[PDB]
Symmetry: D2
């Protein structure tokens, strides 16, 4: 049920495909930040989830470079898929920008995105 | 200078190839936790980093499921590559385990790994 | 604006007094984890926020030790107060448990809590 | 012990006092960022740690307003005190800046500071 087009609360668009090999592949389009149009994404999910009610662990990465623009940053979303009526992906994320060593302390933003298909 | 074998301070070994597209492909062997043997990794990196002296931003993910076991969890490392004599990959990570939604508040461990050649 | 009772989506209850000086004092009661009854909180807030409509920065810490129970752990919430329609305090938090050195890699949980007056 | 003068890897000076009541009080002086001189800090720590070799959980907060300037931001450090050998304090921290609603996704930085007495 992961495979599909999802939207973040931010309004960003997350198009993903979950392979039977546990792969995640698609594109990301951010509603905010130093970004434009779509960015490639790759990640991994648990292809054989617990059957107890547990969500499905997954993660994916976006390097914020594409054909038009390079923010010299990468975001990784770590989280889980939750099934049901209104399936959601609840994540937390780390957005690291390349920095000088002096500035590494402020290299990384953290936050949380929730994704629905609506 | 990212492609090859990297070693975290925990003892873990990260084996990776960086493709010109911006792909990261490889395998991770954890020294800790619910883990055994090698695990597939996939991620992205900035193929065209800045020149002012900035590291190369990258991130990758491991779903802790392989031939030998399934821990029902995944880790994303987000951070940057810093070249030079003692190159490093300096990361922060998020490890999300699948939980009931009642337990989702404690789903996610945060930490940091420094990798070296 | 900050002084008073606030409620976590989780169910937890947070009572604070914001000192003119920038002090945060009060109690926290968790709806989850190794916790029982109320715990002391202390923290700091920006007592001179900007006037552009920007939220008010603040933070607080709870060590999960009280007269009843001790989890050997601590949580810090970092975030901002937003006033208006429905005032809110939006946060992210870090919960660190005491661990041996060999288990330090798994010492800390990360999440987010949004608080409201109702 | 936790009381004393601590130095982060960053060069920052952490001057803290751990009370009997489990309070953390003192001043923080960052070597980096939109800050100068000393800022009040306040926090909590576990006054009754385990005795299995487990570290000591604690955390504190700094609002980055003082008499010289106001960054409209606050950091919280969450971590644990590790005694014996080169005693040290290992933390992760969250730095939230007051922002509009639109800009809240980039309001929070995250990192890790290790403190030693050297
Ligand atoms: O500004 C950059 O460095 C690149 C744009 C990053 C946008 C971030 S990634 C986390 C969050 N979720 C989104 O959909 N957008 C923001
Ligand atoms: O326990 C699990 O759920 C799977 C193995 C977890 C290993 C973690 S990922 C973060 C940290 N860095 C490592 O090299 N290993 C641990
Ligand atoms: O289990 C412990 O060690 C104590 C944890 C207390 C509850 C946590 S703190 C972060 C989150 N927000 C809450 O209101 N409760 C949980
Ligand atoms: O820039 C600001 O908003 C205030 C300065 C913040 C300095 C940060 S707090 C985390 C890190 N550790 C330090 O000692 N300094 C930086």
């Amino acid at each position: 049920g992961i495979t599909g087009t999802w939207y973040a609360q931010l309004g960003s668009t997350f198009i993903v495909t979950a392979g039977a090999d546990g792969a995640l592949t698609g594109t990301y389009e951010s509603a905010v930040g130093n970004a434009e149009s779509r960015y490639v994404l790759t990640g991994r999910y648990d292809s054989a989830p617990a059957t107890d009610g547990s969500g499905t662990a997954l993660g994916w990465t976006v390097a914020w470079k594409n054909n038009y623009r390079n923010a010299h940053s990468a975001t990784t979303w770590s989280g889980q898929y939750v099934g049901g009526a209104e399936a959601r992906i609840n994540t937390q994320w780390l957005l690291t920008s390349g920095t000088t060593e002096a500035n590494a302390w402020k290299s990384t933003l953290v936050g949380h995105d929730t994704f629905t298909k609506v």
